[PDB]
Design a protein around this ligand. Sequence first.
Ligand SMILES: *[C@H]1O[C@H](CO)[C@@H](O[C@@H]2O[C@H](CO)[C@@H](O)[C@H](O)[C@H]2NC(C)=O)[C@H](O)[C@H]1NC(C)=O
Ligand SMILES: *[C@H]1O[C@H](CO)[C@@H](O[C@@H]2O[C@H](CO)[C@@H](O)[C@H](O)[C@H]2NC(C)=O)[C@H](O)[C@H]1NC(C)=O
Ligand SMILES: [Mg+2]
Ligand SMILES: [Mg+2]
Lengths: 481, 481
Amino acid sequence: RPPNIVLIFADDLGYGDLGCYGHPSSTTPNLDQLAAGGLRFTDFYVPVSLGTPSRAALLTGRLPVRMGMYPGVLVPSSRGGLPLEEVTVAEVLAARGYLTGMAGKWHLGVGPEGAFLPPHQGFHRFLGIPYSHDQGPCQNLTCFPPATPCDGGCDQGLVPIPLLANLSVEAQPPWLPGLEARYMAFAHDLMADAQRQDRPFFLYYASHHTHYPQFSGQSFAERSGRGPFGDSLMELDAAVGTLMTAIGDLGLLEETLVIFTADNGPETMRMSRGGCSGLLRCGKGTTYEGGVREPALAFWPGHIAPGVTHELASSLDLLPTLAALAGAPLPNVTLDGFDLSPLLLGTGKSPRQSLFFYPSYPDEVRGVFAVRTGKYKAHFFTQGSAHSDTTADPACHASSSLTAHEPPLLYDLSKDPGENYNLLGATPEVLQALKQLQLLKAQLDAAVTFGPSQVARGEDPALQICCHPGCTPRPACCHCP
Amino acid sequence: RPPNIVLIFADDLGYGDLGCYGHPSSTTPNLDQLAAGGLRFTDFYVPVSLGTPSRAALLTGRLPVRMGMYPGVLVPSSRGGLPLEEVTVAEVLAARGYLTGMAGKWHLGVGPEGAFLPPHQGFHRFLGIPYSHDQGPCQNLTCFPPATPCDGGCDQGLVPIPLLANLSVEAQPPWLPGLEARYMAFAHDLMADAQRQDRPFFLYYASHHTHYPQFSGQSFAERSGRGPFGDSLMELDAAVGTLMTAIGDLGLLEETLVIFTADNGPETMRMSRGGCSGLLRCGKGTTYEGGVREPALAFWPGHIAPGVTHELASSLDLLPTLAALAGAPLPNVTLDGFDLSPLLLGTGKSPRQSLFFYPSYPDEVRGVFAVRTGKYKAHFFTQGSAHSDTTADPACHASSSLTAHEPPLLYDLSKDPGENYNLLGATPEVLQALKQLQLLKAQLDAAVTFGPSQVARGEDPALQICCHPGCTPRPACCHCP
Ligand SMILES: *[C@H]1O[C@H](CO)[C@@H](O[C@@H]2O[C@H](CO)[C@@H](O)[C@H](O)[C@H]2NC(C)=O)[C@H](O)[C@H]1NC(C)=O
Ligand SMILES: *[C@H]1O[C@H](CO)[C@@H](O[C@@H]2O[C@H](CO)[C@@H](O)[C@H](O)[C@H]2NC(C)=O)[C@H](O)[C@H]1NC(C)=O
Ligand SMILES: [Mg+2]
Ligand SMILES: [Mg+2]
């Protein structure tokens, strides 16, 4: 009965990059066709616009500050990770008899002997990199075949990037141009095996596209009309087409729910090798709309009618929506998301009315930075980010320091999705929204306790993964292509 | 044999406003469905981003400086207008036996006894306003029924706005909320009458949406989810649906070519009551992409296959493309556009490789401001505009004075459609494009002679249209609702 679920999650992909979201030069045919036969969201969000906190909110349905996933992101030597008491979507579904698998980027911790890796958090199978593909030296890696080097060199002084098969190093570093093929092969096996055992599968595909540095296989190099950022987006798009064909071939089209979203806004610091937030303001690292609002598509033939919704939805609602769909019971913890099945099935409206946004570096004195309720969004604090540097808007830059706003900056997103015109710079409708927004912020700030910081547990270079354990000299000896 | 042609031309509508171009809250179902069954252009342009010069380029296929359509726009007391020796598309088709008609905004001149009005430039029928609907006092007009006044008051000290039937005042001022119905009725009659006489029709629908001040009939007031700008865009969209139904009802779907575009970018000076250029920079009044690049759709069942093109196209190419399609010979003058039928019919590529952009206020010493060839665009001079004021980008503002750039600012629009990263801030590909761009500008500037300025012929208040001729006191006595 339960449907097969495929969750595709891109990296550093903006609201404005898909062809079907208006980009003028992107090449995204498979995703455009998924949009045309399914539900496209205009108002779907993540609560925090950084890699780690966003992946944690997705898998647990819980605001990242509750389990210490702040500040910033995790690094290869981090001691901390997503606590093992947290229940993930993979576990909710595993206990209901799903065969669960994950391909790609984890970024939720490695820890002493890989205690925080995926196999310990409900995934039966796992093929991927445990953090971002730029958190290790890349001046000698090939990003585009036959021999175009990755640009800029990535993070120095670390072990090369490891490709893992569950808990074992399969390659270090992997060959970037062939990663996609590896991941499609893995996905195909997971599907077929689940079919054979008469059980539903759950595929978590956490792509490295479109994070820096850009790369692709040889079928896409110089073929998109948007340079390296495009080639890489085009490969991600072809991966979606490949998964849809594999779902075709096995006669599972009407029994599989396919969801596509992305973790956080574009890193405009990469300039034309980085994403695009379209009409929205600023990008990764900020609580402006270009940082937190992402593309989101839902496709399930004969169940989800083709259309466009403007209803409020969050990555936080994915656990409870998927549980409900699979007839799995919810964990016994406070959750911050809701079941969106009525909306998906067209029998009801989204139950979500409000959204809460935390910054990259949160603190308990300040609390939530921005809150949206209906079409209104208030900003109590504003701050630019180096990840959103280089565009013409000065509020996006790292030089825009942390600034308090009281009364808050107040925008009507139905008319000013670009956050250009502060309404408080009077009306009874506005005043009532203002008072609601202020009370929602004070209620959440008083009820939420911050879990102890995982990131502040520190770093220990002995925690880096090494293909040749015991090796010397570290870290350059750790390798095995 | 010749197909029936319907040309829909919007006013002050941005690249980012249609639902099918990515807007998150616009309501444009009929246009989205036309896009889904026809050709959508990502790179279609006008040469000058102001009302008058743009309408002149559209109807003649000639750069506006050749016949003196500069500087700025025409006003109700202007003595000048589009010269009668110019040949328009309506004339090209009339001489081939088309029954031609125009509904809406003209803005190409009135003159002594209406010598410059449409009936003198090849249109058989004409129902509309001879200039923009804000060039006359509007503090007492109703913009939205039952009694919501137009915001801000419009231009003062002038005659109220006249609605004309050929050369006669039908109302002054008209009732804004019922204008659409008038225009649809007129369009329906034109179609039917042409059918009855066994002849092809040419409908030129120059909408007032989405120019300030916004207005609509009662079916759309407060129904879009984007306020007044949305309500007005929603009515324009319903007008398109109505014309498509009328084409249905008469069995002419496969014999009619329908084209939709807009004259110039958004007036962001109206803030949330103005348009949106999406990812593009700046708006009306500038030579940045948000000023000159517009939405553009072509629909003709069983002739134009549904798709998306990135090929170069201009409003300048419409005359020669429509002539060719109707088997009508081209006027004997130098034209600046090309026939795009191969592209439309999918048997060839666009013949256009370059585009030339003039500012609102051009001069013969400076010449062309910006030139695009392939994916490269050079800016030799840059300037902001009060029509593009109020956004966060400072280059769009009226305080950004006229600035020369030598060497020019150079952008690769396939990767940086947002014009953020100057390539000259080295490569052999870049250097060759640079030299090409410089030579194209110098060739055009040396070959083009500016026609004598029509706008500089001055104003004469006796040229204002008056419903009660001889009247006193002018101009308030001129009226007849
Ligand atoms: C690591 O672990 C999983 C299982 O723990 C490995 O896979 C299994 O895959 C083969 C066929 O592909 C089956 O015969 C077994 O029954 C599978 N076990 C389960 C529980 O599914 C796999 O080699 C590794 N993960 C991957 C795909 O890298
Ligand atoms: C002004 O002029 C046109 C014609 O010059 C008027 O219309 C004609 O319309 C009626 C039916 O609608 C026909 O009987 C005539 O044959 C038409 N003439 C032509 C040349 O088409 C019309 O009333 C006015 N224009 C509009 C529609 O306002
Ligand atoms: Mg990310
Ligand atoms: Mg205009």
